[PDB]
Design a protein around this ligand. Structure first.
Ligand code: HEM
Ligand SMILES: O=C(O)c1ccc(C(=O)O)cc1
Ligand SMILES: [Cl-]
Length: 393
């Protein structure tokens, strides 16, 4: 019925070049079984989209990683939104959607845009820079911790903590275990900044605590919802912006089109999110014996969704290996789909738009002038270092 495959989607050889193995996963069938970790896998757009939009059958409360929370204890207290199902997910999701609302983006857009223009001006004075550390990392670190309301001290724990959370979604390989074996300092800092006295007024974290009045969340729920923003609102955006600059460096014809019409900046970032898919994979757990694409999946089984493979499926996308800033990206699952679709997608799109807008208006060429190093993560796909030479427009 179901083809069995020995491909390890969490090995270094897979992270280094996943596209050939992702076609093998798609072409093998709509549902595969991965003997390496005893999990079901779906790599086509159709099945990935169906699993995401059936939260009842493919639950999230038993973990969005490999580990089954009904069988093992989670390395940290479960997230009140990511690792919950309706109706327990509904009200905490509604609060976060109002904290990161369209009305919230209006209060932060000008400061986010100004900091984006100032960063590109600073990098043009240096010429040859690292598009990861000096751009993909430096810019979100310059706007997001302030928008969260975090103090200055201890911000060096934010990125290590985020990479740990995303590595912990994977199997118990060395990547996950070495991350957990280094987690105590990063866990202590993040848990402390989630408390109301440590969140500056007006920030995202303080806004969450102010939503305990309405009966949607209780005061004891607010710290964990702040923890979700510190776990998902930084490193995701870093690799998304790093992906956008990477594509603009690998597709100069698309950079020139972006320069001619900087209003394409928002879609240029969205296409980058589809092209690279910073969030490559995560899991669901069947609550019931379900038939998916002609295959019977039993109860309590982990289902691995390949978001990046779904975003490159030729059954859904015309020329999926092509970076096209004018492509109608509507329907891609880079931000997920359904009740769990990324609640911070407006913040990420704002950061990506104003950074690509600043590059469109100020930069004439982006040329790689050094060794490209890939950052390895069980869930995240991104670059460790991207040496580029920026030519002023
Ligand atoms: C390029 C940037 C980003 C990408 C690619 C991304 C990707 C995703 C994806 C695919 C999901 C679905 C998870 C699932 O279905 O299990 C998700 C959920 C989530 N994201 Fe993002 N995200 C990004 C930025 C952000 C930002 C900026 C924030 C907060 C400021 C954030 C916070 C969250 C939260 C809290 C959830 C859980 C929502 C829920 O379970 O209902 N993410 N993200
Ligand atoms: O990057 C992600 O997919 C993600 C990680 C953590 C959380 C959370 O802490 O609720 C939500 C989303
Ligand atoms: Cl924690």
């Amino acid at each position: 019925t179901i083809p069995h495959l020995a491909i390890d989607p969490f090995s270094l050889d897979f992270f280094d070049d996943p596209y050939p193995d992702q076609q093998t996963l798609r072409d093998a069938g709509p549902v595969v079984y991965l003997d390496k970790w005893n999990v079901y896998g779906v790599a086509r757009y159709a099945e990935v989209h169906a699993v995401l939009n059936d939260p009842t059958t493919f639950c999230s409360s038993r973990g969005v990683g490999l580990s089954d929370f009904k069988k093992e204890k989670p390395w940290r207290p479960p997230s009140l939104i990511l690792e919950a199902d309706p109706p327990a997910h509904t009200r905490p999701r509604a609060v976060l959607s109002k904290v990161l609302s369209p009305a919230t983006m209006k209060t932060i857009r000008d400061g986010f845009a100004a900091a984006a223009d100032a960063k590109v001006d600073e990098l043009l004075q240096r010429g040859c820079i690292d598009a990861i550390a000096d751009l993909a990392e430096a810019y979100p670190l310059s706007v997001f911790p302030d928008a969260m309301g975090l103090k200055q001290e201890g911000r060096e724990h934010l990125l290590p903590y985020a990479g740990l959370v995303l590595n912990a979604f994977g199997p118990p390989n060395e990547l996950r275990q070495t991350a957990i074996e280094r987690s105590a300092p990063h866990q202590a800092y993040v848990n402390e900044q989630c408390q109301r006295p440590n969140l500056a007024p007006g920030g995202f974290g303080a806004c969450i605590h102010a939503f305990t009045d309405t009966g949607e969340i209780t005061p004891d729920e607010a710290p964990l919802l702040v923890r979700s923003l510190l776990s998902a609102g930084l490193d995701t955006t870093v690799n998304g912006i790093g992906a956008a600059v990477y594509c603009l460096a690998r597709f100069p014809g698309e950079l020139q089109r972006l320069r001619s019409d900087p209003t394409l900046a928002r879609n240029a970032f969205e296409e980058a999110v589809r092209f690279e898919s910073p969030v490559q994979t995560f899991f669901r757990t069947t609550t019931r014996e379900v038939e998916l694409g002609g295959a019977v999946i039993g109860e309590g089984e982990k289902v691995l969704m390949f978001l990046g493979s779904a975003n490159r499926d030729p059954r859904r996308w015309s020329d999926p290996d092509l970076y096209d800033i004018t492509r109608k990206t509507s329907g891609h699952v880079g931000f997920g789909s359904g009740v769990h679709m990324c609640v911070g997608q407006l913040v990420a799109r704002l950061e990506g738009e104003v950074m690509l807008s600043a590059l469109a208006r100020k930069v004439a060429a982006i040329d790689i002038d050094g060794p490209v190093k890939r950052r390895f993560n069980n869930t995240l796909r991104g670059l460790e270092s991207l040496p580029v030479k920026l030519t002023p427009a």
